[PDB]
Design a protein around this ligand. Structure first.
Ligand SMILES: CCCCCCCCCCCCC(=O)O[C@@H](COC(=O)CCC)COP(=O)(O)O[C@H]1[C@H](O)[C@@H](O)[C@@H](O)[C@@H](O)[C@@H]1O
Ligand SMILES: CCCCCCCCCCCCC(=O)O[C@@H](COC(=O)CCC)COP(=O)(O)O[C@H]1[C@H](O)[C@@H](O)[C@@H](O)[C@@H](O)[C@@H]1O
Ligand SMILES: CCCCCCCCCCCCCCCC(=O)O[C@H](COC(=O)CCCCCC)COP(=O)(O)OCCN
Ligand SMILES: CCCCCCCCCCCCCCCC(=O)O[C@H](COC(=O)CCCCCC)COP(=O)(O)OCCN
Lengths: 537, 80, 79, 67, 80, 67
């Protein structure tokens, strides 16, 4: 084999498989070619930005990855040296891990990877019936299913989660079963192992807590078992727990609003408690407000500690955690300024109050229409309002500086006042003759009319047009993002659970077929999905 | 969503206002509603301390409601 | 014709500088109208900051859409 | 805006192309790195025995058909 | 502005003996799915007078397809 | 749940014309009403309503020959 660092370990068998020469592969295997040689040169590794092609470093994985069913069948089932199907590379990836890794979710890629995955698994069952091939974990601890979920390979995940194999001595490999049938109706059973909970790399946890760079994190939850599974968990318990949380937060904000509204107007806190009923209720409300702020503070800290976002995933993603955390930060700064004898605690408190009432929009998830609407609000803020505010603020600052330069020795002639007066045009309140403290009236009115045309007539109506294009284009994306948000809510509610709920599983230890590789009966905690098909009588 | 935002920023603003003509949830809610109909004064009172906090609250309310939610309503009615 | 129907940015930057130079001429000519030329130069320069939205795909495409709105819809509407 | 999406993308790309050409033509430092491709041997066999180096640009592609 | 002919020429690949030197697109190597193309860039990046990038960019605005011509593969990737 | 299901209902369900013919030859009751809750509405429990009768079962399963 090659000794060069770029192609270290490449045998002639790798070239023969690459060249799709079946006869050369047969001759090489006949002459004792090693069928578990590790081609681990720098060309064959990951880091796709460099030139290279990763296939799992082994010739069986090469033959599988290149869509050569004959060569994988031969290498597993040759007379001289059968290849170990559970062989592992430097990463710990098996053949199925390599097939998952090379997928890119295109139609032809999904077709061949699905077929090769199926055939490799079937051959593994035939040659090694006792082997649980799909339970092998690489050095990152990921099974092929967990690798598919973590990497966003929706084409492979969507195949695996509803896999049907009908051949005798292979039905145990299936993950979708049929318990019974009638005429148009039949009841399907989905495996559900390592989906709802396995304490390591459950598919729901892997998808929901992805780092936002996964290509299809929003689309992966639309597959047949996961969507119904999340809806079932929702309607089982999380709808009630979530609505209770929403009610509690509403009470919290009502109490905070009441306590802040009736703050004492005297100077220099802390305020002596006058012996009267209203002030006792006020002090109780303030204490509850600070208590809830501390609660959200520690919840945010727990989020950041449990997840450890890598300094960008907490700005591109998970906005609600940041917003609730900042609300609590404003509350705690308000407490510090309150006991420090500073009036600025009112400033911190009112920012906390406004932010909390706007964070009430968090709970629109769990309601489909309001949740999708809130998702669209998020996308408008991030894409259209951001571009608009960049260009708008550039124009506002430019024309404000020109106008305040023109104005001389007046009640205006500060940059702030002129900026505010030019901003008033945006809200339909611009005076257009707010001062006469200038010379050159034509210059003043030309500047203001140019500002009006460029901002109020052009940019606001253009913002309406671009938001129209956006709502025309983000419908399906908004529904998927809402479903992902509700999924994250479901997982957090299940992981909090507050009473040691035993009902973590969905639908009982149903017997699927009861034909393992041995004579034993396998129970898999299945999930039932009743389906109707008028075709295929 | 608009009434949630209106009530939130109205409560914040009336909390900031102290011993003034408005100084009440109804009057502040009405003054913040006036932005929606293109009649918001944006300096309707000076009975506070912390002018920066007042104007930041009103500008944030304006951006979140008048610029964003109304134009989004127009866009969504277009889609509908 | 290509001096006006195309290459708007060069024309706008040139006109900004023309306002600056006319401001200098009026400044040393003892005329207050240098303030008029200066403020037109200043406003035009801050609006010409939109030139640098290219090199960012989203802001660049947005600026191009602003250009086309001005040329087609705002022109017909303003007529 | 429903109709100028691709047109705006193309016009932006043209604007950035003009920027690139102006930046490389001005350049203020006599830097030769603007030649952007590198001198590779394409075939090395012209109609005569001589070899052809043609300053090519590499573009990697992936296909799952026509094996 | 003949975008069709330009799109033909810039990725021209002729698979026969004594004509491969005419090509402007070459495949240096090819693994199973992966293969690396090579585009010529003679008279594209820089040349005596009439570089294709300079000709397209500094066109007189009466060319038919001047906006769309830079989408032809080697030109877009070279500019990026 | 499968109350009232006769052999004729199973024969029609399995699409076996021969078994239906043999059962009707042996005096199978062609008006037997399958009154089981599996053969009724209220889909919260699995099932399939077909009108409870073998003729209606044959019609609802696209078995024109049995009809
Ligand atoms: C002074 C007062 C100022 C208030 C200003 C702010 C107003 C809006 C407040 C609205 C509160 C609702 C909320 O809680 O925040 C919204 C975010 O709205 C914004 O855009 C705020 C911009 C800052 C939802 O954030 P979310 O947690 O759902 O993040 C998504 C993930 O969940 C999901 O998995 C996906 O990865 C998705 O890509 C992620 O984005
Ligand atoms: C007192 C204050 C008055 C301010 C008035 C002016 C406000 C606008 C200021 C906007 C500044 C942004 C900018 O820099 O100018 C914009 C032009 O916006 C307009 O429409 C102005 C209408 C006049 C882009 O011009 P550009 O040079 O990119 O021209 C394109 C070519 O590059 C490209 O190759 C194609 O041929 C393409 O078809 C050409 O268009
Ligand atoms: C969508 C954005 C629209 C922009 C709206 C206008 C605000 C931007 C102002 C930018 C110009 C620079 C500001 C300088 C601040 C300052 O130093 O000016 C102060 C004003 O202080 C403040 O209110 C701070 C404002 C906080 C800014 C919150 C965004 C003092 O002089 P006054 O004339 O007001 O009082 C004088 C009484 N004889
Ligand atoms: C899209 C909604 C926009 C919101 C517009 C503002 C209204 C929301 C008010 C909510 C706060 C609670 C209201 C409390 C009522 C009250 O007690 O306020 C009363 C006035 O009562 C009313 O007008 C009832 C209003 C009926 C509500 C019709 C939606 C008097 O105080 P004044 O300061 O005005 O007069 C004092 C003269 N010395």
């Amino acid at each position: 084999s090659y000794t060069d660092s770029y192609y270290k370990g490449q045998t002639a068998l790798h070239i023969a498989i690459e060249r799709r020469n079946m006869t050369l592969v047969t001759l090489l295997v006949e002459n004792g070619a090693d069928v578990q040689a590790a081609a681990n040169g720098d060309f064959f590794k990951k880091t796709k930005g460099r030139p290279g092609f990763y296939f799992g470093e082994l010739p069986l994985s090469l033959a599988a990855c290149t869509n050569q069913l004959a060569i994988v069948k031969f290498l597993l089932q040759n007379s001289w040296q059968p290849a170990d199907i559970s062989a592992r590379d430097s990463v710990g990836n098996t053949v199925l891990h390599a097939l998952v890794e090379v997928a890119d979710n295109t139609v032809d890629n999904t077709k061949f990877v699905t077929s090769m995955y199926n055939e490799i698994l079937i051959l593994g069952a035939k040659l090694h019936p006792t082997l649980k091939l799909e339970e092998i974990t690489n050095r990152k601890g990921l099974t092929p299913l967990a690798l598919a979920a973590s990497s966003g390979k929706i084409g492979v995940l969507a195949y695996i989660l509803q896999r049907e194999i009908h051949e005798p001595e292979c039905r145990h490999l299936s993950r979708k079963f049929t318990e019974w049938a009638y005429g148009p109706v039949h009841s399907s059973l989905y495996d559900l192992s390592c989906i709802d909970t396995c304490e390591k790399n459950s598919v729901l946890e892997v998808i929901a807590y992805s780092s936002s760079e996964t290509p299809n994190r929003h689309d992966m939850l639309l597959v047949e078992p996961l969507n119904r599974l999340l809806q079932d968990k929702w309607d089982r318990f999380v709808k009630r727990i979530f609505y209770f949380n929403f009610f509690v937060y509403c009470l919290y904000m009502i109490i905070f609003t009441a306590a802040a509204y009736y703050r004492p107007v005297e100077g220099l806190p802390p305020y002596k408690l006058k012996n009267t009923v209203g002030d006792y209720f006020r002090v109780t409300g303030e204490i509850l407000s600070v208590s809830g702020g501390v609660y959200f503070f520690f919840r945010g800290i727990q989020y950041f500690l449990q997840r450890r976002p890598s300094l960008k995933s907490l700005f591109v993603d998970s906005y609600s955690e940041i917003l609730f955390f900042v609300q609590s930060l404003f509350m705690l700064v308000s407490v510090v300024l309150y006991f420090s004898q500073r009036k600025e605690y009112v400033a911190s408190m009112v920012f906390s109050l406004a932010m909390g009432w706007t964070n009430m929009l968090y709970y629109t998830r769990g309601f489909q229409q309001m949740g999708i609407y809130a998702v669209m609000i998020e996308k408008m803020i991030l894409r259209d309002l951001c571009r608009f505010m960049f260009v708008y603020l550039v124009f506002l600052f430019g024309f404000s500086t020109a106008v305040v330069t023109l104005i001389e020795d007046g009640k205006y002639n500060s940059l702030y006042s002129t900026c505010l007066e030019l901003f008033k045009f945006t809200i339909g309140m611009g005076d257009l003759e707010f001062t006469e403290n200038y010379d050159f009236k034509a210059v003043f009115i030309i500047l203001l009319l140019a500002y009006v045309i460029l901002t109020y007539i052009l940019l606001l109506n253009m913002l309406i047009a671009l938001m129209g294009e956006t709502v025309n284009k983000i419908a399906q994306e908004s529904k998927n993002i809402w479903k992902l948000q509700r999924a994250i809510t479901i997982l957090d509610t299940e992981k909090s659970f507050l009473k040691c709920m035993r009902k973590a599983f969905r639908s009982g230890k149903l017997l699927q077929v009861g034909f393992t590789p041995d004579g034993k009966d396998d129970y898999r905690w299945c999930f039932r999905v009743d389906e109707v098909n008028w075709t295929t009588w």
